[PDB]
Design an enzyme around this catalytic site. Structure first.
Site, PDB file in Angstrom:
ATOM      1  N   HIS A  41      24.604  -2.925 -28.089  1.00  0.00           N
ATOM      2  CA  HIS A  41      24.019  -2.444 -26.841  1.00  0.00           C
ATOM      3  C   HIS A  41      25.049  -1.822 -25.907  1.00  0.00           C
ATOM      4  O   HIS A  41      24.672  -1.359 -24.824  1.00  0.00           O
ATOM      5  CB  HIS A  41      23.202  -3.547 -26.128  1.00  0.00           C
ATOM      6  CG  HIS A  41      23.998  -4.674 -25.532  1.00  0.00           C
ATOM      7  ND1 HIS A  41      24.835  -4.516 -24.446  1.00  0.00           N
ATOM      8  CD2 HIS A  41      24.025  -5.993 -25.834  1.00  0.00           C
ATOM      9  CE1 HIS A  41      25.369  -5.683 -24.126  1.00  0.00           C
ATOM     10  NE2 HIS A  41      24.901  -6.598 -24.956  1.00  0.00           N
ATOM     11  N   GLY A 140      29.465  -8.791 -18.038  1.00  0.00           N
ATOM     12  CA  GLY A 140      30.713  -8.380 -18.656  1.00  0.00           C
ATOM     13  C   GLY A 140      31.233  -9.285 -19.749  1.00  0.00           C
ATOM     14  O   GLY A 140      32.252  -8.962 -20.371  1.00  0.00           O
ATOM     15  N   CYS A 142      29.622 -10.029 -22.550  1.00  0.00           N
ATOM     16  CA  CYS A 142      29.091  -9.732 -23.872  1.00  0.00           C
ATOM     17  C   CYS A 142      30.226  -9.355 -24.810  1.00  0.00           C
ATOM     18  O   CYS A 142      31.196  -8.697 -24.421  1.00  0.00           O
ATOM     19  CB  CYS A 142      28.058  -8.602 -23.816  1.00  0.00           C
ATOM     20  SG  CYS A 142      26.706  -8.927 -22.689  1.00  0.00           S
TER      21      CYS A 142
END
Ligand SMILES: CC(C)(O)CCOc1cc(Cl)cc(-c2cc(-c3c[nH]c(=O)[nH]c3=O)cn(-c3cccnc3)c2=O)c1
Ligand SMILES: CC(C)(O)CCOc1cc(Cl)cc(-c2cc(-c3c[nH]c(=O)[nH]c3=O)cn(-c3cccnc3)c2=O)c1
Lengths: 297, 297
Positions: A41, A140, A142
């Site tokens: 993503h 942030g 991920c």
């Protein structure tokens, strides 16, 4: 003596964390040999994205990978399930011995929380029966990874998203989600969770190893009679495999598994009556039998 | 979202851990530049040892220092308070930016538990008001260090011994014990402990930041009226300095410190009535205000 929620030493993973930027989106990546792994993503801007389309429209130069204060050059890019794989021109010289593993619910692992490719902290958690983890993650994070160490780092979790209840969902390092989740913004909630019985029993054995004995009793139960109480209190059934796994702890303490189950039954039925176990007022289920043996031995 | 007992990433300290053997005694040492720091009781065999005498009788060759699979050569040896300093012939190439700090009670730090120079795990703990720590340590852990990171590692604790209650005593990295303890086998028990009030308040602010609000109320208290209740429940007095320290958390949540104190008073007087806060059934006091801000921001 003492018993603490203990993480693995994080150094071997710290040396693998990088920053991956795609447009205005920045998250963390895992750099092993000449490949960088990160959540796909990162290519989104997405109630219902078509990732095949989004990736066709990208070039290598759309991916900025930063390892410390050094820019890595992307020389190839592919997608595997929900992970992006970015081939870079330089192999990570700090790559540890490693493997990728997909864990079962009830297993524990260490999380190295990172922001902008920079590790922030390390903590222990468990894969819940409903395939979420109760982590600590901000925007942030991920691409932060979960792992166990055996000199070999077994990566088992990459962080992808936070669910509305504040719990966390992600994938193995091949990009397959744990649980039924998908990487888009839609209505998806965790299923009802349950307590990890074999882990609670492990932690009671830890308590005995550390001198907490007040919950012990002279009674025993049958596996079947115990599992009847388990279900009433939303605990996972205990299997003969679980009993066998607890073998070493039962032998070190001389308390039969089915004797400890009678303790757990009493605790479920009557509570702690104002007492604590290993400093907790509730029954802890995020230590595996292996975790107890590692820390108490 | 989420709130976890989070340690600092341990890599910078892992690269400093070594094995120190003296006769039949082996423990851990901290290798920074060309010096190895370790507990001086490595030279013992000791109801009442005279360390000056024991060290005069040693030569450099009596000290075997192992960094991984490499032998370091001891070229000098001295004693500073309760720490041994072993000068070695090779500077540690992995020495991080570092300093030595002596912390106040109520401050937290990360422990890297080690055996035989090899890191085993990392966890968070606090210096208790009675100058013990509630760690997780087995035989062979002496010389494991506690630290905070700011790219600079501030070492604040070296582990020396376990007390009879199962809690742990040690020194700053200059060899000065926290608390009244001495490094010999004699009758020494921890003093009575108290709860770290400012940390409990910090953790309640963390809970609000994470959506636990059930304990809030419309009342406020005076600092004096609060401290009257604190003493009754064996909590440390709250000072104006503590109030000021909580300033940022009070501002982010819009809940005045003295309003949160009225919540804490209610919780002390009536308990939780079967509810939990950040997954705990008791009031947690091993997160500092700084710890909350770091993890929630
Ligand atoms: C469908 C559902 C699950 O119900 C609602 C959430 O749906 C998604 C879906 C996807 Cl595909 C990503 C995210 C997400 C994206 C980001 C993110 C976006 N843009 C960036 O530049 N950087 C980021 O780090 C962060 N965090 C997040 C926030 C807090 C904790 N953990 C993760 C996220 O959770 C959420
Ligand atoms: C006086 C008091 C405090 O009441 C009773 C204890 O008194 C002392 C005094 C001293 Cl000076 C050292 C030790 C001690 C020594 C060792 C040790 C000895 N020999 C080795 O080859 N290696 C070792 O790692 C270990 N652990 C220990 C054990 C468990 C957890 N943490 C520390 C120890 O606690 C205890």
């Amino acid at each position: 003596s003492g018993f603490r929620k203990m993480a693995f030493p994080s150094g071997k993973v710290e040396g693998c964390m990088v920053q991956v930027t795609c447009g205005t989106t920045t998250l963390n990546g895992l750099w092993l040999d000449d490949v960088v792994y990160c959540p796909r993503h990162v290519i989104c801007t997405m109630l219902n994205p078509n990732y095949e389309d989004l990736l066709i429209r990208k070039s290598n130069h759309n991916f900025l990978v930063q390892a410390g204060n050094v820019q890595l050059r992307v020389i190839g890019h592919s997608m595997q399930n929900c992970v992006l794989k970015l081939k870079v021109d330089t192999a990570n010289p700090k790559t540890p011995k490693y493997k990728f593993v997909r864990i079962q619910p009830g297993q524990t692992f260490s999380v190295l929380a990172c922001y902008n490719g920079s590790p922030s902290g390390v903590y222990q958690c468990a894969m819940r029966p409903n395939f979420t983890i109760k982590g600590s993650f901000l925007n942030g994070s991920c691409g932060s990874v979960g792992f166990n160490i055996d000199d070999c780092v077994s990566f088992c979790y990459m962080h992808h998203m936070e669910l509305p209840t504040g719990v966390h969902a992600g994938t193995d390092l091949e990009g397959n989600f744990y649980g039924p989740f998908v990487d888009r913004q839609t209505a998806q909630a965790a299923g009802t969770d349950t307590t990890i019985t074999v882990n609670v029993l492990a932690w009671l054995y830890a308590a005995v190893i550390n001198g907490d004995r007040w919950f012990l009793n002279r009674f025993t139960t049958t596996l079947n009679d115990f599992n009847l109480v388990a279900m009433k209190y939303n605990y996972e059934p205990l299997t003969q495999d679980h009993v066998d796994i607890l073998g070493p702890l039962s032998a070190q303490t001389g308390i039969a598994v089915l004797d400890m189950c009678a303790s757990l039954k009493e605790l479920l039925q009557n509570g702690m009556n104002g007492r604590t176990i290993l400093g907790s007022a509730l029954l802890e289920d995020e230590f595996t039998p292996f975790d107890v043996v590692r820390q108490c031995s």
